[PDB]
Amino acid sequence: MLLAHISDTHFRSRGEKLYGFIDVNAANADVVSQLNALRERPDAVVVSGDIVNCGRPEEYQVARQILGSLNYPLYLIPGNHDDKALFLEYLQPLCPQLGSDANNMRCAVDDFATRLLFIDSSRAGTSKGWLTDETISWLEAQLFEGGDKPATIFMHHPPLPLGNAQMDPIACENGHRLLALVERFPSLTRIFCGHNHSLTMTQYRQALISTLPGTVHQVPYCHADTDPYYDLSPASCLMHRQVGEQWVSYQHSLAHYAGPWLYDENISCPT
Amino acid sequence: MLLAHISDTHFRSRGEKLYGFIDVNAANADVVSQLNALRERPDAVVVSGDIVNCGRPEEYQVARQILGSLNYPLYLIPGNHDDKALFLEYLQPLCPQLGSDANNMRCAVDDFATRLLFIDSSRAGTSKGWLTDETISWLEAQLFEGGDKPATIFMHHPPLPLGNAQMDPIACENGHRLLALVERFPSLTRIFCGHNHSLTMTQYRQALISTLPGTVHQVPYCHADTDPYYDLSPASCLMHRQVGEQWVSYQHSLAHYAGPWLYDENISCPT
Amino acid sequence: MLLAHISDTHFRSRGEKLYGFIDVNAANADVVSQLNALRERPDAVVVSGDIVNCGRPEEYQVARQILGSLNYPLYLIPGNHDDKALFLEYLQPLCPQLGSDANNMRCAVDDFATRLLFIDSSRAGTSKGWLTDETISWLEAQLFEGGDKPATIFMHHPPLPLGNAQMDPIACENGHRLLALVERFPSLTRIFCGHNHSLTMTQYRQALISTLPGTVHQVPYCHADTDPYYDLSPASCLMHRQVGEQWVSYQHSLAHYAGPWLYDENISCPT
Amino acid sequence: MLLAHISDTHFRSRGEKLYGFIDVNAANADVVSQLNALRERPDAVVVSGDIVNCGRPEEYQVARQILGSLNYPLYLIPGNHDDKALFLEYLQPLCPQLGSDANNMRCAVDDFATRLLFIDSSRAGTSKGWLTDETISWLEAQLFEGGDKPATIFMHHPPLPLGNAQMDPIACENGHRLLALVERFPSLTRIFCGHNHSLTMTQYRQALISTLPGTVHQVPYCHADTDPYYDLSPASCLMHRQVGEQWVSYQHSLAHYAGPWLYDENISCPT
Amino acid sequence: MLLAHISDTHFRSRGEKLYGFIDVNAANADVVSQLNALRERPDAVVVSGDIVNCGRPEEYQVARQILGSLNYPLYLIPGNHDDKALFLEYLQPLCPQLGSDANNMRCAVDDFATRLLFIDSSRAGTSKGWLTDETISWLEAQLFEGGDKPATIFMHHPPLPLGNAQMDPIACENGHRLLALVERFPSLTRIFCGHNHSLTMTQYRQALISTLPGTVHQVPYCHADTDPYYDLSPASCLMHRQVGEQWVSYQHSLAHYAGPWLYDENISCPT
Amino acid sequence: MLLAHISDTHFRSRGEKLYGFIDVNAANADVVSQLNALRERPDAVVVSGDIVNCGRPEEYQVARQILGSLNYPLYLIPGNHDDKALFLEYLQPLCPQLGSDANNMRCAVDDFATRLLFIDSSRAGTSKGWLTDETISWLEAQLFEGGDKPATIFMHHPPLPLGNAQMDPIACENGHRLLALVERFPSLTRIFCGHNHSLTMTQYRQALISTLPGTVHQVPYCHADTDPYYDLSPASCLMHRQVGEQWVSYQHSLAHYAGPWLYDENISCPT
Numbered sequence A, B, C, D, E, F: 001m002l003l004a005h006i007s008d009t010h011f012r013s014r015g016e017k018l019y020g021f022i023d024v025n026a027a028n029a030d031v032v033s034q035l036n037a038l039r040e041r042p043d044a045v046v047v048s049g050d051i052v053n054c055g056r057p058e059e060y061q062v063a064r065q066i067l068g069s070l071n072y073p074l075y076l077i078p079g080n081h082d083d084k085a086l087f088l089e090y091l092q093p094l095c096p097q098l099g100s101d102a103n104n105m106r107c108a109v110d111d112f113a114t115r116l117l118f119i120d121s122s123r124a125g126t127s128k129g130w131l132t133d134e135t136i137s138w139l140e141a142q143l144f145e146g147g148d149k150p151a152t153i154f155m156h157h158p159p160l161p162l163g164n165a166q167m168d169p170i171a172c173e174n175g176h177r178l179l180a181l182v183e184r185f186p187s188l189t190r191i192f193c194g195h196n197h198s199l200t201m202t203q204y205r206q207a208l209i210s211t212l213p214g215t216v217h218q219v220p221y222c223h224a225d226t227d228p229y230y231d232l233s234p235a236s237c238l239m240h241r242q243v244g245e246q247w248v249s250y251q252h253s254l255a256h257y258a259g260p261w262l263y264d265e266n267i268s269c270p271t
């Protein structure tokens, strides 16, 4: 298993830039061509929500074209910036396993050594996350019927506060219900989240829980300041690889930077 | 608890650049000034090994001046590029708890809600890591006395293969020794490493294990290509913060980038 | 009093770039988000003319949306690139004090310790400036009835030649009539101008007279060369602050640059 | 008269960088070459203080070589970072009119239509400025003999508070002494300063008073924040040109930017 | 004779970027303004094919506007990305000598000391080049009836393999027929080509044969790898100047770079 | 045969920059590492003169270390900035075939299908080139013994005027001597030169004659302007490859740029 995992693409409609000046559509089309150009090709690409910025049909048209140009199977989940009905109408053809009920988009993948569970934590009318009664139950069904095979969950909202003053009030409001599932099920060992536009990681019991950077704009972690900052610090994604018994995640920079060169002992320490 | 955690500084002697073209001394001095300019000021700065590039006295003179200019208590450990004896002669005044014995540099910090354990995985005459039995028994004694109080370990070399074709052969060669300790002690919940010049994370039982990006040059993760690449992709550090009973790690970019701006709902979705 | 003062925005219509390659709309939307992100917030933003590039309705639509997203009261005046009727139709809702006569857009503001006078020096069918009979008179009425309270004028065109070979032939043609007002009225102590896309300043009697940089593209000052140059040297704006008896103007860079860091005596002069 | 006016060079010793990361010596050498490459060649170059950063002999050796490579007559004055004795030993051969006495460095230039007065506001043992009575009486005598011929003064420290929270406490402490002279002498019409690393301008009676940007690092203007910030925002200098009876100052960017191109009406507004 | 020679503009339609992220329309409009800003003005501009990316009418509309804003006579030829009929419909007004038969676009220019021959090597339905029976014959007529006057050919496709693994299979398939003409006609001494997006040159008999960089994106030369790479390495064009008996071609960079400065002996080698 | 061909390195002494601001030593060390990192590895590296900037021993110490770190056989020739005696003392161990006599440095290489002839056009006491009669008769003997086997010559100075107003007066002063040899020997088909810091190519009979870009700073081609300009436009080198019976030269960018990506027909022309 090799997965490329990007998040928080925030597509805008065809003539438009995010906030009027951040060319998210171009930045995302660059990211897509970077992923298709990889020498070590992923089995699938994951996009953990906030696919469009305004939940508008014209943004979904752009998202469909650009994400549809990925030469990889896609696993797509919504964030609070998404519209459920439009997300399903436009993007389900790119991720058929979502289903055809816009209120219950979920899928389990077990092509790999680790089971993958994709859920919708987005809630209409709020920036906060919510795990529906039926999502919590289906999650518990996957883990209860899943025996000893490890599981990883992909969801938009972090299921616990991370001390981030901007982002904590809008984490998954009943995320403690998912933490109850990690306490009860030793097989649940990874939870990967968007939302935060930041690489921030913690462990709860046997589960490593991490948010991802966005593909374009980032949000800095502030502990005290609640001012709603964003910046254009370097974008990146996470590669997830199965290495024997170990699920390893490594950061793959999506910036354009000098290099690489080759290490040489004589050049490193001249005499 | 707030910690700033950098590694793999690779200081050169005064007037030299890494490989003749990477100005590591300037770049690290920029980093030191970034860390002194932080609004949310850390309680301490950790530097997780490969402080100098060639283990030369004149490189340690530069490291001592530049790291000595941090306005914080420092916790310093060696990497394979370090020389144990010179590291102690030059850097022990910056980190008095290392001690008087270059072959047994390690210390425990009990100031915070999680205990911090700093160890030396570097071995003279090789790039590979090695955990001596005296390090392992010191760790056993620390973890046993510690009881239910959580513990994090800082070491240069990752204690398990991460699937990185360049870095795996030179990981901690007897890392099983540390893995056996995480199995023994449910208290041991973080291991943070340098060496890989890359943010790559994994979980072994209750322990999150992560390598850090370098402060200057990075090394890309390749699974099958063995070429010793390095590049100048974006540098960062990890901030470690105790948030309730959660240890949270977030990436803090060391690059100079545009922003921040403030999010505004009218600018986000114009009508 | 704190005023942010930008000039020469040169908005283009929605799909378009200035000269086909300079993204003025994005550059201006960045500038707008920079102004809304200021820690020390201005009481008002001034835009001293050339708001659009071609005097076209579709450019005014863009200008209205982007300038309308400023979270500040606005004082807007036209330049030679503007159309009076369209400027009034589209932008008067953002600056109601202009009036409803497109040929006589003028306003006095005296919320502050210094009176502010905003005038239209633009003339239909020419790049040169002209002060209408009625503008000169209204200006003299403000100063004559204004007693000892200092006054500052904002106008698009400089009221005197500055030795700039490109820009002098197209300064305010009867600007000497305004200089007659500074000779006669000691209270008139500031005249700020756009047009030149350059910070150039001089004093005439008690009046400091200055042109501003543009928000996007600049024009270099040449004394001999009349070739119509523009470049993309760094953009900036002027902040105007009342500091006791003193009106002080400082340049605020609108570029994205490294920093800031904090000055430290030990780092400045190492021993 | 054409003058190029730079300041706050902050030269370091050979092989050192400011704060360990700002290559001031390279950046100033770039500036010197930019000034030698000017198409409209100045009659002289003014450098308004803080020539070196630490007042060290080896910094003056660098300053002497780099400033000595300007293909122009120089007028040099000290700032607080300078050492008076060493400044005279090293730099007087570049500016012979300073004299033989390190405590009374000043000179008048009568080559041009406006007389130029260069003075020393630096005081040993402090960052604050000080105008000695011998400086004030020399100025009185210069301004009295000068009669109706306009005069500009060059000094390191601004003679009044500008509202800059970082810079105000270290302005010219007894600047009232100079303000009293502008009240006395209607002839005194410009005062140009370094120290603030910022273009900030004001008017006191008939005098325009301006501080200049630095050639390398800048300091942002904060009204309420006291933190000693510096950044690497765009560097520039001021060109001073006599234009008829107008002294005009224009900003000349020292950055490397795209352009220039030529304005073309068809490209400006396509049909 | 001075000719500016650009190639492989790859215009997209008005809202669009190449591959979604490369702004070819803006990059080309910058290139056009660079050419109109030249101090040493060419007699004509040559564009050696791939004018548009998709052979679509809306791309030709953009090409017509941007290339039409060049203040120079134009010689335009198609590449494999062009549509013959649309190329003629939209661009023949900019290069009337093409004719009015879209299948036989060719022209000879002999205003200069060297005859210029412009041909269409593009073939409907393939990326490969083909010289039509009638093109080969007309070429031979020009050279046979042209006596001792030197000739240069401009064509899109290289008439011989260059060892480039990506580009060789799609060179001019019967290019050996043109090589037969260089063997037979000593007056044919230059063949300049697009297609390769790379400066690559060789000689065959008395003929120098060269491909050009693109104005925007480039393709790297690989000898073994057939992966279809493109990158954004620096763009440039070729200037062609007649210097006595010599046709000289020099590379003119279209990037924005620091400089120029003036060489000075004392600065070059300090003492 | 694959050759990497760089020139005009202009190495400075340790800790110095060219003109005080161009870090030639770092930039060339970057280049050396780029050449060691090549996927298609050259058989040898040619450096065509102006190895050092001032002909100083300490510059040759830097050149020896940095060029000595190339993992390839080197062919080195001097330029006018070189000192013949010091060039031989320091660089002959890197290029043993130069010999023992500083006044007659030259060699022939017969390893490849085309013979390579390396000569010294530098003349003590001038910038101009000079071909000694002993060089010419050595060349005659080489070309006569060589018979039908093609030959390329590497020399620092171009053997004919290229119309470059800065560079023509300091070309090879007696270059007619070499032109006479191309007339004599149809076998002599390439002459490659440094000196001009520019890719400029021409053809004389069966010979392609080209100057190369520098590895760091470039010089623009001006036909009428005599000012000694240099800039920091993009650096490159030439790769020389034998492809069947064709010698092909391609430009290899030494800049750090975005890419590569892979071409995809759906992304190229979306529907």
Ligand SMILES: [Fe+2]
Residues within 6 Å of the ligand: A008, A050, A079, A081, A195, A197
């Ligand atoms: Fe988001």
Ligand SMILES: [Fe+2]
Residues within 6 Å of the ligand: A050, A079, A080, A081, A156, A194, A195, A196
């Ligand atoms: Fe979100």
Ligand SMILES: [Fe+2]
Residues within 6 Å of the ligand: B008, B050, B079, B081, B195, B197
């Ligand atoms: Fe390292």
Ligand SMILES: [Fe+2]
Residues within 6 Å of the ligand: B050, B079, B080, B081, B156, B194, B195, B196
């Ligand atoms: Fe290491």
Ligand SMILES: [Fe+2]
Residues within 6 Å of the ligand: C008, C050, C079, C081, C195, C197
């Ligand atoms: Fe304007």
Ligand SMILES: [Fe+2]
Residues within 6 Å of the ligand: C050, C079, C080, C081, C156, C194, C195, C196
């Ligand atoms: Fe204007």
Ligand SMILES: [Fe+2]
Residues within 6 Å of the ligand: D008, D050, D079, D081, D195, D197
């Ligand atoms: Fe200063």
Ligand SMILES: [Fe+2]
Residues within 6 Å of the ligand: D050, D079, D080, D081, D156, D194, D195, D196
């Ligand atoms: Fe100062």
Ligand SMILES: [Fe+2]
Residues within 6 Å of the ligand: E008, E050, E079, E081, E195, E197
């Ligand atoms: Fe092409």
Ligand SMILES: [Fe+2]
Residues within 6 Å of the ligand: E050, E079, E080, E081, E156, E194, E195, E196
């Ligand atoms: Fe093509």
Ligand SMILES: [Fe+2]
Residues within 6 Å of the ligand: F008, F050, F079, F081, F195, F197
């Ligand atoms: Fe050279």
Ligand SMILES: [Fe+2]
Residues within 6 Å of the ligand: F050, F079, F080, F081, F156, F194, F195, F196
């Ligand atoms: Fe040379």
